[PDB]
């Protein structure tokens, strides 16, 4: 419908500097043509943003949220 922003990855700018403390709550979107792109809410901001997966306190939160 568009040209290429719709099916592909949701996610473009991630913010890593995000930590636990700040962030809000969490979400994920499941899409096919892409992988799992972890989305967020930072309280300080109070906004929606996408997450870093090899972040300090999103490594552990990985870690149990995966197996």
Same mark, same amino acid.
């Given at each position: 419908?568009? $040209?290429?922003?719709? /099916?592909? &990855?949701?996610?473009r700018?991630?913010?890593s500097h995000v930590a636990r403390? =700040?962030?809000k709550h969490?979400? #994920?979107l =499941?899409?096919? =043509? &892409?992988?799992? !792109? #972890?989305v967020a809410r930072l309280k300080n901001n109070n906004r !929606? $943003? &996408?997450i870093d997966p090899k972040?300090?306190?999103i490594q552990? /939160?990985?870690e149990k949220a995966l197996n």
């Open positions: 419908k568009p $040209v290429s922003l719709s /099916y592909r &990855c949701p996610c700018f991630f913010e403390a =700040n962030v969490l979400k #994920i =499941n899409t096919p =043509n &892409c992988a799992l !792109q #972890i !929606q $943003v &996408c972040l300090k306190w552990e /939160y990985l």
